[PDB]
Amino acid sequence: YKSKMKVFFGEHVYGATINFTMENQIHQHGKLVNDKFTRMYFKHVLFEDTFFDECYFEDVTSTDTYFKNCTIESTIFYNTDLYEHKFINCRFINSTFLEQKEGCHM
Amino acid sequence: SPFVNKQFNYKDPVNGVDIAYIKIPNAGQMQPVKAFKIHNKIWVIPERDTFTNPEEGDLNPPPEAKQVPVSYYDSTYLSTDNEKDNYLKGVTKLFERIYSTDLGRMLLTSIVRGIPFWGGSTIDTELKVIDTNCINVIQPDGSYRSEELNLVIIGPSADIIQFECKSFGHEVLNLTRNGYGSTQYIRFSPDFTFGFEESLEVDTNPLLGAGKFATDPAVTLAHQLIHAGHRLYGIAINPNRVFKVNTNAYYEMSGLEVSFEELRTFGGHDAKFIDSLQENEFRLYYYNKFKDIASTLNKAKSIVGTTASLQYMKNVFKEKYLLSEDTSGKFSVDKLKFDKLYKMLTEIYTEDNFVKFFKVLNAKTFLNFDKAVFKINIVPKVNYTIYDGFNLRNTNLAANFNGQNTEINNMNFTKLKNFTGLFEFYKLLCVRDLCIKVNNWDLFFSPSEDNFTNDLNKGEEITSDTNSLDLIQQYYLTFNFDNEPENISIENLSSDIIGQLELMPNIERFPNGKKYELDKYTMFHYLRAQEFEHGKSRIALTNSVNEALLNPSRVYTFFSSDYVKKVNKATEAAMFLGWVEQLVYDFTDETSEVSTTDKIADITIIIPYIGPALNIGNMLYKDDFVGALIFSGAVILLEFIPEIAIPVLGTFALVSYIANKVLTVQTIDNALSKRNEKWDEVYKYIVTNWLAKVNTQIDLIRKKMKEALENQAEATKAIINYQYNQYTEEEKNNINFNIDDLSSKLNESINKAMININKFLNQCSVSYLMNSMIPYGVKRLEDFDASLKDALLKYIYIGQVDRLKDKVNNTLSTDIPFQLSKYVDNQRLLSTFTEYIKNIINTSILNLRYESNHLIDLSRYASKINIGSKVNFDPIDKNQIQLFNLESSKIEVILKNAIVYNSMYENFSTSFWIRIPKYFNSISLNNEYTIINCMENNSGWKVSLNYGEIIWTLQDTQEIKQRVVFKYSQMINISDYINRWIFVTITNNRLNNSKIYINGRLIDQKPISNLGNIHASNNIMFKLDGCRDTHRYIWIKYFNLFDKELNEKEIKDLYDNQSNSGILKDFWGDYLQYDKPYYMLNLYDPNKYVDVNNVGIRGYMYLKGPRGSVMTTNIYLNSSLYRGAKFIIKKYASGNKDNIVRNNDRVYINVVVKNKEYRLATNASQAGVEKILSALEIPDVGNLSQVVVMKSKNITNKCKMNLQDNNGNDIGFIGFHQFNNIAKLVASNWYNRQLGCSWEFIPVDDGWGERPL
Ligand SMILES: *[C@@H]1O[C@H](CO)[C@@H](O)[C@H](O)[C@H]1NC(C)=O
């Protein structure tokens, strides 16, 4: 598993709606602007130094994913299990945290 | 024991002791005239006065009428025996009536006792009678017996109804003003009485009709007796001391002479027109005169011209002047006894006191001029009883003074034709024609500034020792009786007593018919526009004065257009009776109207029609009149602005005694006492100025309002009568209409309106007194207090310094309250003054409020309210002011320079409602920006803000700073201070502490006593200064400043009053509104939001959580509010056209689901107390209970909804019940039996910053 780890550097993802499952990836210095994660599975994916922007998280189920040093701005986390403990040294900006799936899901 | 014993009839013989031919002094030779003595030293001569004055030898009217409002001329009066006997009986009855009263008894005893002084001897050591102060009664044997007398009563001169007290003067001595005294001849007639009109009696008898009251002759005789009593002791003021006025302007009386003697005699309200300095000067002058005559009495040791022993004469003069001998024949005056005697002769003996004792009507002030001449009969007891007068007991005249009303008691007074024409003395006013003549006695009374003088500026040095009917009753017990100067034999004088009357100053004739050209329509023009001639042709009302003055047959009216349309309409007989009733209904409606706007300070009852009634301020719109009133205070009512200027009060020079311990404490006590005396004296001077210059104009405006209302009523009555006159005989007899009942009901409506007009004018006068006159004196007094405090503290600089310093600091830190009860005795005005004092806001110093599209200082202390071009006002409620972070988004308040004192801001309070949006940018942290500034030269107080902090800063010149802060956190689930209105108040006392309260609860306090010189400022800056955040802004409203520390009770009262409990409020504290979508929040469970479930009958609504979270790291973390289904409020039965909801309104509730509206209804027939709510499509069944009554009061408990059935039965308060697992919404009656019934409406706001996904 660990051999097939995808390293991502310097991304600029604009206006993309994500519907599938992405697994075993790390993102560094990403700039996820106006994205949308709806009804998907996060599996062993790591975010570092990524700058979110007005992204929308809906019915996203996460496992072993962890946000680090990310600037998260103007986002909405509705119906999710991405609890507080999944965020490490992250700065929120004008963000929100609405209904959140109860219990972790795998 | 009656005054006059053994009634004299007229034709009794010429005996020589009680009824005899006498020869009074005269210029030449006079035939002896029959005169009757009625008591000791009192004679009556029932003849016309053609003897004393040689000029007054004729009884015909003069070619040039006098400057007199009412006068009757006659020639056949008192020429027949019956007339003389009737005159005698009337005079005797009036004397007995005066004598019965305790005050009258004292007056008559004093007049009888006070014989004229014997100063006719050229040599200084002799006493000789004045040759002109005695009469000659000729005995039937043939010789005369010269006798000394005090009073003489003579029938009037050519002018029948002109009563005056004359005296016989001396060659070198002014007997009537140097204490010697002289005989007084009164020209009085009881058969005639002036008639006045009273319009301030309705407060006791609302059923009273018109005025036209007749003056009781007893009061007039008492006035003349008071004049004689003043002149008998020689303490009368010189006639040239006259109350001068101004006559140049068009609104001023052409001429009205009123001497200081008349002001003293009138007493009561009139006597206050002379300041205390002139009273002091007169008292000192007459004390010196009494000392001089006492010394003259002491020096003399021989008497020539009489048999009686000298010692008896010295005793007589000692008991007259209350001199104090000391068992060595050394007469001397004492200040206490002479002060008592002067106060009795000046203040106790007054016409107002006689009016109070007699309990009769009279003109409360000399301005209420007489109007008619009434011939009356006094001799019969059936018309005038000795004890009561015209107000006979046990009859219809007993109550409401109906005995003095000529329109009830018609048979007792006969109206006579007075010779002074209505337009004999007039002023001719007109605009740039239509020139109208206005009678001189119908113009404003404007006293000049010369009559008021002050000794305030002069300084004072302090040393070791520097210092009501019950009162009349106490004087009555203290008074001395049983000692009346016995008759003395005087050697007879010459047959002809040569003597000339006291010389009077020449009064120049005021010019008549002055022509004035103006540029506006004055109030006299409007009054003369409403008059008419009772002509034969029809009279139509109109609303254009330019045509009413021009056309005689059309009268101006200030009522609505509907009324003038109605009264101009030709109506048949079949509708005449209904027409009249409609007309009286419209009369009552228009006259009883009042103004709703009350935010004004104690001008609560504003009468609108007054504007068009007199053209007040030169606008002809009632709405414009109310706007101008609120904008400019009570100034617009005044025709001329009084000029009041208090000089800089003098300093107190304190003497120091070497090595003394008790006297210095006495000096400190004396300084504090004299401080209180200075405060009282300045207050009294200001009250006197206000009474003389302001209240008179208000009284005139009141009288003119009454006259205008009477004119309108008479015009309507004339129109009705003319329409009635046109019918045929069968029409008149079948349709009967009478005039008396119509007149009575119109008069009652006029009285009902007049009560409100009087209340409004009293409020205006008191408001002007407390707003524009008192502060100009308070500034001087408190500046003087500050100046004296430093001198006192330097003076303390043995062994008692701490207590004395505490005493002086606490004494001079505060101020003496102004209570009107110690300066005026008018009940009607004192009640309104107490109402003024009651409200705390009325006593505020700065009262910035938005009124009539203008931001104005309702307390009238501010000179300039400067407004920037980038300051926003909320359209729904214009009071809320929004200030941005721009250089041009500022407000400036510039106070009046002559009201602000240097030592202000020592004890003061401030209060304002502020709304502060959430802090978003991280720059806001550790950033303090001033939002209110009052600092100059780095000194004063400023209100600043910071991240979750409200700071109050007080700084002095020495750079010392004291801060009180209120800190509220932003990291909370639900905050009561973030983007919500909060009522901040701050109270500073220099002595102890400075405190800050938030929402009426004490929050913080800190000492400020260490501060030095906090030098006061003049500008107030509402501007965000120093804020690094670029989009920062605040909301501020209801700013108020107070000149005294506020306790907790006053703070809570302010919070309750300014909260405006009548209007329901949303979450942020704004006004709840119709047709606006609000999210719902429950206070019982604030962690869950309202959601809907299958809209329809079978669905419901429940509460589910958690709400969520809205966060910005290191800045804030608050639970989201824009969640759930939004509620909107649709009107149902609110008649108000605005969308603002109020208490007890009935409303419909709509819930939005999928951007579609569903009515909030339920079926009340389901079992159990709980009635689960539901959402139904708006085309639902009306049988389901849906109407919701909104309430905000029980004490106020948030905003509650009460579901009601269609039949008025109360389904109950809205709320939530945990019906099984799902917590549904229910209309429960358990909540009606007082939580969970309190709700909060959260609308989308731009200060919260949450995005409604
Ligand atoms: C991918 O996105 C499309 C577009 O909305 C959607 O039709 C599809 O269902 C998504 N894929 C899955 C596995 O749901």
CA distance A79 to chain B (A): 11
Sheet with B1001-1006, side-by-side order of all strands: B871-873, B881-884, B1033-1042, B907-915, B982-989, B994-998, B1001-1006
Ligand 1: atom nearest CA of A39 is 14
Check B1251 against A95: CB less than 8 A apart.
no
| B38 and B80 housed in the same domain | yes
Q: Which residues of B touch A94 (CB under 8 A)?
A: 920, 1112, 1249
| Domain-wise residue ranges, chain A | 2-96
Question: Which DSSP state fits B591?
Answer: H
Report the C-alpha gap between B1108 and A80 in whole angstroms.
12
User: Could you tell me if A94 lies within 8 Å of chain B, comparing CB atoms?
Assistant: yes
Residue from A76, A98, A101 to probe the interface with B (highest B Cβ count within 10 Å) = A98
For residue B515, what are the β-bridge partners? B428
Phi, psi values for residue B1120, rounded to 5°: -65, 145
Q: Count of CB contacts below 8 A, A vs B?
A: 36
Indicate the residue of A90, A93, A97 with minimum beta-carbon distance to B1109. Answer: A97
Compute the CA torsion angle B360, B366, B371, B372 (nearest 10 deg): 60
Euclidean distance between the first and the last CA atom of chain B, given in angstroms as a whole number = 103
Domain stops at, among B445, B478, B511: B478
Distance of CA B693 to the CA centre of its chain: 13
Phi, psi values for residue B1102, rounded to 5°: -135, 180
The answer to the question of residue B313 being in a domain is yes
Residue from A76, A82, A94 to probe the interface with B (highest B Cβ count within 10 Å) = A94
Phi, psi values for residue B346, rounded to 5°: -105, -45
Non-local (6+) Cβ contacts of B410 within 8 A are none
Distance of CA B1219 to the CA centre of its chain: 64
Cα–Cα distances (Å) from B356 to B107, B349, B402, B825, B833, in that order, read 15, 12, 17, 12, 23
> Can you list the alpha helix ranges (DSSP code H) found in B523-655?
523-529, 545-548, 561-567, 576-591, 610-614, 622-632
Question: Do the strands B540-542 and B554-556 form a parallel or antiparallel pair, or are they unpaired?
Answer: parallel
| B785 and B850 housed in the same domain | no
> What is the best residue among A19, A36, A38, A60 to mutate for testing ligand 1's pocket, by most ligand atoms within 8 Å of CB?
A19
Which amino acid makes up residue B1030? Answer: T
DSSP reduced 3-state for B841: helix
Which amino acid makes up residue B607? Answer: I
Measured by CA distance, the residue closest to atom 7 of ligand 1 is A19
Which amino acid makes up residue B298? Answer: N
Ligand 1 center–CA A105 separation, angstroms: 21
Instruction: For residue B1191, give its domain range.
Output: 1079-1242
| B1163 and B1054 housed in the same domain | no
Whether residue B702 contacts residue B757, with contact meaning beta carbons closer than 8 Å, is answered with yes
Residue with tokens 């009769």: B360
How many contiguous H segments (helices) and E segments (strands) does chain B have? 23, 51
Measured by CA distance, the residue closest to atom 6 of ligand 1 is A19
- Is the distance from the beta carbon of residue A21 to the nearest atom of ligand 1 less than 6 Å? no
Residue with tokens 């005139």: B700
For residue B1103 the two structure tokens come to 């509460």
Measured by CA distance, the residue closest to atom 9 of ligand 1 is A19
Which amino acid makes up residue B44? Answer: V
| B849 and B828 housed in the same domain | no
Q: Which residue in B409, B373, B372, B375 sits closest to B390, CA to CA?
A: B409
How many contiguous H segments (helices) and E segments (strands) does chain A have? 0, 15
Whether residue B1214 contacts residue B1227, with contact meaning beta carbons closer than 8 Å, is answered with yes
Cα–Cα distances (Å) from B1142 to B1061, B1079, B1238, in that order, read 9, 19, 16
Q: Which residues of A touch B920 (CB under 8 A)?
A: 94
Q: Which residue in B157, B159, B156 sits closest to B65, CA to CA?
A: B159
Q: What burial class does residue B495 get, using C-beta atoms within 10 Å of its C-beta: 0-12 exposed, 13-18 middle, 19+ buried?
A: exposed
Euclidean distance between the first and the last CA atom of chain A, given in angstroms as a whole number = 18
| B263 and B356 housed in the same domain | yes
| B636 and B605 housed in the same domain | yes
Q: Which residue in B231, B305, B233, B299 sits closest to B261, CA to CA?
A: B231
Whether residue B940 contacts residue B956, with contact meaning beta carbons closer than 8 Å, is answered with no
Domain stops at, among B835, B867, B897: B835
Report the C-alpha gap between B669 and B675 in whole angstroms.
10
| B649 and B698 housed in the same domain | yes
| B750 and B893 housed in the same domain | no
For residue B1040 the two structure tokens come to 């108020």
For B102-126, give the DSSP string.
HHHHHHHHHHHH-PPP----SSTTE
Report the C-alpha gap between B790 and B782 in whole angstroms.
13
Q: What is the CATH number of the domain that holds B1101?
A: 2.80.10.50
Whether residue B1119 contacts residue B1087, with contact meaning beta carbons closer than 8 Å, is answered with yes
Question: Which DSSP state fits B772?
Answer: I
Gapped junctions in chain A, after residues (C–N > 2.5 Å) = none
Residue with tokens 């990403």: A30
Q: Which residue in B136, B115, B337, B346 sits closest to B232, CA to CA?
A: B115
For residue B1236 the two structure tokens come to 């969970």
The answer to the question of residue B6 being in a domain is no
Cα–Cα distances (Å) from B194 to B227, B262, B371, in that order, read 19, 17, 7
Which amino acid makes up residue B552? Answer: P
Whether residue B1122 contacts residue B1196, with contact meaning beta carbons closer than 8 Å, is answered with no
| B1200 and B1173 housed in the same domain | yes
**Rg, chain B, Cα only:** 40
Question: Which DSSP state fits B78?
Answer: T
Would you state the CATH architecture of domain A2-96? 3 Solenoid (2.160)
Non-local (6+) Cβ contacts of B162 within 8 A are B66, B68, B71, B156, B187
Q: Which residues of A touch B1250 (CB under 8 A)?
A: 96
Question: Which DSSP state fits B451?
Answer: G
| B445 and B530 housed in the same domain | no
DSSP reduced 3-state for B1041: strand
Q: Which residues of B touch A99 (CB under 8 A)?
A: 1106, 1108
Q: What is the CATH number of the domain that holds B333?
A: 3.90.1240.10
Whether residue B421 contacts residue B135, with contact meaning beta carbons closer than 8 Å, is answered with no
DSSP reduced 3-state for B955: strand
For B973-998, give the DSSP string.
SS-SSSSS-EEEEEEEESSS-EEEEE
Report the C-alpha gap between B42 and B114 in whole angstroms.
12
User: Could you tell me if A51 lies within 8 Å of chain B, comparing CB atoms?
Assistant: no
Report the C-alpha gap between B451 and B786 in whole angstroms.
31
Q: What is the CATH number of the domain that holds B667?
A: 1.20.1120.10
Check B1251 against A93: CB less than 8 A apart.
no
Report the C-alpha gap between B520 and B429 in whole angstroms.
11
Question: Experimental method used, please?
Answer: cryo-EM
- Is the distance from the beta carbon of residue A19 to the nearest atom of ligand 1 less than 6 Å? yes
Whether residue B431 contacts residue B521, with contact meaning beta carbons closer than 8 Å, is answered with yes
Residue with tokens 């802004």: B1033
Q: Which residue in B517, B443, B509 sits closest to B252, CA to CA?
A: B443
For residue B107 the two structure tokens come to 């007056």
Please count the structural domains in chain B. Answer: 4
Q: Which residues of A touch B1248 (CB under 8 A)?
A: none
The Cβ of residue B381 has, within 10 Å, a number of other Cβ atoms equal to 10
Distance of CA B529 to the CA centre of its chain: 30
**CA-based torsion, B556, B562, B567, B570: positive or negative:** positive
Question: Which DSSP state fits B1062?
Answer: T
Report the C-alpha gap between A67 and A78 in whole angstroms.
17
* Geometric angle at alpha carbon A69, from A67 and A72, rounded to 5°: 75
Q: What burial class does residue B1204 get, using C-beta atoms within 10 Å of its C-beta: 0-12 exposed, 13-18 middle, 19+ buried?
A: middle
For residue B983, what are the β-bridge partners? B913
Indicate the residue of A74, A91, A96 with minimum beta-carbon distance to B1109. Answer: A96
DSSP reduced 3-state for B950: strand
Measured by CA distance, the residue closest to atom 3 of ligand 1 is A19
Distance of CA A69 to the CA centre of its chain: 12
The answer to the question of residue B997 being in a domain is yes
Q: Which residue in B557, B554, B614, B621 sits closest to B587, CA to CA?
A: B557
Report the C-alpha gap between B29 and B9 in whole angstroms.
28
For residue B453, what are the β-bridge partners? none
Q: Write the secondary structure of B1104-1116 as one string of H (helix), E (strand) and C (coil).
A: ECCCCEEEECCCE
Ligand 1: atom nearest CA of A20 is 13
Angstrom resolution of this structure: 3.5
Check A96 against B1108: CB less than 8 A apart.
yes
* Geometric angle at alpha carbon B1039, from B1038 and B1043, rounded to 5°: 130
Report the C-alpha gap between B436 and B645 in whole angstroms.
37
For residue B94 the two structure tokens come to 């009036």
Which amino acid makes up residue B171? Answer: E
Which amino acid makes up residue B463? Answer: T
DSSP reduced 3-state for B372: strand
Q: Which helix (H) or strand (E) holds B830?
A: helix B827-838
DSSP reduced 3-state for B364: coil
Check B1108 against A90: CB less than 8 A apart.
no
Long-range CB contacts for residues B1225-1228, cutoff 8 Å, separation at least 24: B1225/B1090, B1225/B1100, B1225/B1101, B1225/B1102, B1225/B1103, B1225/B1172, B1225/B1173, B1226/B1170, B1226/B1171, B1226/B1172, B1226/B1173, B1227/B1162, B1227/B1164, B1227/B1171, B1227/B1173, B1227/B1185, B1227/B1203, B1228/B1169, B1228/B1170, B1228/B1171
CA distance A90 to chain B (A): 8
Report the C-alpha gap between B962 and B1009 in whole angstroms.
10
Indicate the residue of A78, A92, A98 with minimum beta-carbon distance to B1112. Answer: A92
Residue with tokens 């309002």: B705
Compute the CA torsion angle B682, B685, B686, B690 (nearest 10 deg): 170
The answer to the question of residue B1069 being in a domain is no
Whether residue A66 contacts residue A45, with contact meaning beta carbons closer than 8 Å, is answered with no
The Cβ of residue B513 has, within 10 Å, a number of other Cβ atoms equal to 11
Report the C-alpha gap between B99 and B3 in whole angstroms.
6
**Rg, chain A, Cα only:** 13
Check B1110 against A93: CB less than 8 A apart.
no
Report the C-alpha gap between B1158 and B1128 in whole angstroms.
10
Measured by CA distance, the residue closest to atom 11 of ligand 1 is A19
DSSP reduced 3-state for B962: strand
The Cβ of residue B1129 has, within 10 Å, a number of other Cβ atoms equal to 24
The Cβ of residue B658 has, within 10 Å, a number of other Cβ atoms equal to 4
Q: Residue B875: is the preceding peptide bond cis (ω within 30°)?
A: no
Cα–Cα distances (Å) from B383 to B329, B377, B391, B740, in that order, read 55, 7, 9, 26
Whether residue B168 contacts residue B499, with contact meaning beta carbons closer than 8 Å, is answered with yes
Whether residue B201 contacts residue B828, with contact meaning beta carbons closer than 8 Å, is answered with no
CA distance B1120 to chain A (A): 8
Residue from A38, A55, A73, A99 to probe the interface with B (highest B Cβ count within 10 Å) = A99
Gapped junctions in chain B, after residues (C–N > 2.5 Å) = 432, 467, 797, 1194, 1234
- Is the distance from the beta carbon of residue A96 to the nearest atom of ligand 1 less than 6 Å? no
The answer to the question of residue B574 being in a domain is yes
User: Could you tell me if A99 lies within 8 Å of chain B, comparing CB atoms?
Assistant: yes
* Rounded-to-5 percentages of helix, strand, coil across chain B: 30, 25, 50
Residue from A53, A80, A93 to probe the interface with B (highest B Cβ count within 10 Å) = A93
Interface of B with A (CB under 8 A): 920, 1106, 1108-1114, 1120, 1123, 1249-1251, 1253
Check B1112 against A94: CB less than 8 A apart.
yes
Q: Which residue in B164, B163, B197, B196 sits closest to B72, CA to CA?
A: B163
Report the C-alpha gap between B149 and B36 in whole angstroms.
12
Distance of CA B460 to the CA centre of its chain: 34
Q: Which residue in B115, B343, B327, B353 sits closest to B223, CA to CA?
A: B353
Ligand 1 center–CA A19 separation, angstroms: 6
Q: What is the CATH number of the domain that holds B931?
A: 2.60.120.200
Indicate the residue of B920, B1111, B1251 with minimum beta-carbon distance to A97. Answer: B1111
Whether residue A33 contacts residue A12, with contact meaning beta carbons closer than 8 Å, is answered with yes
